[PDB]
Amino acid sequence: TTIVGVKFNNGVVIAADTRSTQGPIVADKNCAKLHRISPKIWCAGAGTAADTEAVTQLIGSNIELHSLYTSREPRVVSALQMLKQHLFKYQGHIGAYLIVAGVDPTGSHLFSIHAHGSTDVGYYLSLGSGSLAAMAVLESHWKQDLTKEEAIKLASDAIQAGIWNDLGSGSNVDVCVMEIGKDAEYLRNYLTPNVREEKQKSYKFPRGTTAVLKESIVNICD
């Protein structure tokens, strides 16, 4: 996994690769690692996949209820506080490593959360097995006051470093852009530089190839 977060002048961008693995094996070649906590607060996770999704949905649910209750737009500091307190309680057993980014009435925010419940703030971050490849790109090209365009480019380039150099990362790049004035834009498969080449042969079998013992129609109704 490679996930990054990059702040620009009017907002924040997150990006992630699209490969999930079971040990050395690739299960999903194009899964979404970008997750919505609320409309303008988005989230990328590394670690125990079920944990990062569950912790996102739980806190997402509570953030909605809070928002409805208070009649306000959800803040990023609320997502962060609820996440860290929840993860802390579980003393690292919920293996959620998250980059949380978004915009709210108080501005734009970028945070990392570690599974034991510690948090950090920053202008650029990476997590996952590919975080070192991505950080080397970020440390090379990040500058203060980036345009939206520049920030998308940089985040995308960080994910590629992860994709090309880290065996834990691969396939495509997803981006989400959160700008202070606007609706958030989720950009599925922003890059697709890993198209499988056409196979040399077709493997469709002549019908009747498989030996069948018996057969029956299955009742679905009642």
Binding site: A32, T48, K204, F205, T210, A211, E215, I217
Partner: protein
């Protein structure tokens, strides 16, 4: 030892043109000892199909639990559960036992009865959803299955062709796994009808 390797077992699901297929072997073992030649691992709640591999006690338990939960759903909702919804129900049910999990690899197949779109999904033992549109594999021969499927698969296959592909994937993966095989069942699922076929295979 490893709870997911005691009993054996493989399940594979595939999508085609306006159809899905789901298949499993029939073996139930106890380590080296083969016990049952008739252990089916695929179940169906209305038009939603669920395969489960792993510890056989948990296979049985989860089948009974999902029969329970979908029966109630139908009574309250006054309609059969859809593939998408059921996928979510399996996920949260598994995650509910996060620190004492069922030792299973579930697989969901079916056609949404409103949109007509074919649907498959996979999970890990704690309910992390594998959302993939082509194939899903699970069990003690998952490596062999991934190999077969990535090689054999092409999209938009006619039900009669998809049948061959899924069967050939299952048979050959099973034959390279000591704990899988002993018979196999394949379901071709078309909106309107479902056909079930028992394959002829090596009995070693």
């Amino acid at each position: 030892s490893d709870p997911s390797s005691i009993n054996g077992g493989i399940v594979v699901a595939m999508t085609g043109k306006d159809c899905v297929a789901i298949a499993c072997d029939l073996r139930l073992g106890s380590q080296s000892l083969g016990v049952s030649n008739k252990f089916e691992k695929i179940f169906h709640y209305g038009h939603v199909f669920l395969g489960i591999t792993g510890l056989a006690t948990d296979v049985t338990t989860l089948n009974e639990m999902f029969r329970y939960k979908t029966n109630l759903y139908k009574l309250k909702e006054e309609r059969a559960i859809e593939p998408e919804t059921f996928t979510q129900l399996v996920s949260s049910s598994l995650y509910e036992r996060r620190f004492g999990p069922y030792f299973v690899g579930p697989v969901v197949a079916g056609i949404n009865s409103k949109s007509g779109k074919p649907f498959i999904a996979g999970f890990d033992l704690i309910g992390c959803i594998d959302e993939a549109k082509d194939f899903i594999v699970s069990g003690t021969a998952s490596d062999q299955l991934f190999g077969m499927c990535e090689s054999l698969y092409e999209p938009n296959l006619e039900p009669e062709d998809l049948f061959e592909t899924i069967s050939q994937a299952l048979l050959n993966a099973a034959d390279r796994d000591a704990l899988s095989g002993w018979g196999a069942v394949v379901y071709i699922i078309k909106k309107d009808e479902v056909v079930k076929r028992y394959l002829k295979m090596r009995q070693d």
